[PDB]
C-alpha cells in the first residue's frame, strides 16, 4: 500500500504574551509519532508512538534543533506577514506549514509537499514538479520571487526525494505491523423509536484501521440517502477509528433495510440488518 510521512506545523502570535506558540506534529499514515510544543514544560521533540523509543538521543537532538530553527523562522515570518497585509489592528494571526512525502506501494514519490497558509487560507505551495511555486495572492508573489531567486525549490527537492522517503521507510520498519496493520471494523445495527410513522436505524462501524471506510444504506437492494445522516470518521483514542450512518424509515418496515460496510480489512463488504 501507499504511505505518507507528514509534518503539520502551526505558529500562532499572541498579543501581550511575548513569543508566539509553536507546535509541530508528525504523522506516518494515520498515526502520530512525534511532537514539538514550545509551551511544554519541555521545548524538545518527543515521541508519541511506542515504537519511536528505539531512536538514540542524537536523533532527538537533531530533530529539536531543526524544530527550533523553524520556530525562529516562523517568529520572523509572522511579523513579515502582518507587514505584507498591512494588518494594523494587531491581533493573533496564524501561520501553518505542511510538508512531507506521499509514496506509492512501489515507493514512487507520488507527491512531495511543501506548503504554507496564513490566517486560514493558502499562502504559497511547492508544485508537484518540485520546481515551481503557487502563490495564492499578491503578497505571496514577494515571497515567491525571493524563493525563486534563492533556489528553495531545489533545496527542499533534495529533502523530499531523499531524507523524507528514507526515514519514511525507516519508520515503517520500526513500527512494522503496528503501522502496516489492518483492523477490520466491528459492525452492528441499532434500532431507535421516533414517532408513530417512523423510526431510526443506525449502522455502526467501530475499531477499524486505516480510517478510509464507506457505509451505505439500501432498501431491498437499492441505495438510499433520502434521509441519511452520516457523521465524520472519528478517532477512538486507541489508534482505531469509528463511524456511523443512520436512516429514518417507516415503522414496521425496518426489516427491509440493509447496511453495507466497505473497508480494506473486509475482503467482501459486510451486509447487516437489524
Amino acid at each position: 500500500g501507499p504511505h505518507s510521512l507528514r509534518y503539520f506545523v502551526t505558529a500562532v502570535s499572541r498579543p501581550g504574551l511575548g513569543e508566539p506558540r509553536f507546535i509541530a506534529v508528525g504523522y506516518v499514515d494515520d498515526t502520530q509519532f512525534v511532537r514539538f510544543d514550545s509551551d511544554a514544560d519541555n521545548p524538545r521533540f518527543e515521541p508519541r508512538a511506542p515504537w519511536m523509543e528505539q531512536e538514540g538521543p542524537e536523533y532527538w537532538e537533531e530533530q529539536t534543533q531543526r524544530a527550533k530553527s523553524d520556530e525562529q523562522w516562523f517568529r520572523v515570518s509572522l511579523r513579515t506577514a502582518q507587514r505584507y497585509y498591512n494588518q494594523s489592528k494587531g491581533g493573533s494571526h496564524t501561520f501553518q506549514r505542511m510538508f512531507g512525502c506521499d509514496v506509492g506501494s512501489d515507493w514512487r514519490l507520488l507527491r512531495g509537499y511543501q506548503q504554507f497558509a496564513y490566517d486560514g487560507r493558502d499562502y504559497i505551495a511547492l508544485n508537484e514538479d518540485l520546481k515551481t511555486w503557487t502563490a495564492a495572492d499578491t503578497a505571496a508573489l514577494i515571497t515567491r520571487r525571493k524563493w525563486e531567486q534563492a533556489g528553495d525549490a531545489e533545496y527542499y527537492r533534495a529533502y523530499l526525494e531523499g531524507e523524507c522517503v528514507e526515514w519514511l521507510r525507516r519508520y515503517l520498519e520500526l513500527g512494522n505491523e503496528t503501522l502496516l496493520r489492518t483492523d477490520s471494523p466491528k459492525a452492528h445495527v441499532t434500532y431507535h423509536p421516533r414517532s408513530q410513522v417512523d423510526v431510526t436505524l443506525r449502522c455502526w462501524a467501530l475499531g477499524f484501521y486505516p480510517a478510509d471506510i464507506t457505509l451505505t444504506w439500501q432498501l431491498n437492494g437499492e441505495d438510499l440517502t433520502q434521509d441519511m445522516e452520516l457523521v465524520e470518521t472519528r478517532p477512538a483514542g486507541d489508534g482505531t477509528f469509528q463511524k456511523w450512518a443512520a436512516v429514518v424509515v417507516p415503522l414496521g418496515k425496518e426489516q427491509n433495510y440493509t447496511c453495507h460496510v466497505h473497508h480494506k480489512g473486509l475482503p467482501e463488504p459486510l451486509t447487516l440488518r437489524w
Binding site: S77, A150, Y155
Partner: peptide, 10 residues
C-alpha cells in the same frame, strides 16, 4: 525526519 533548516526568509 524534520525538514532541514530554512535558508530564505518570508
Amino acid at each position: 525526519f524534520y525538514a532541514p533548516e530554512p535558508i530564505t526568509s518570508l
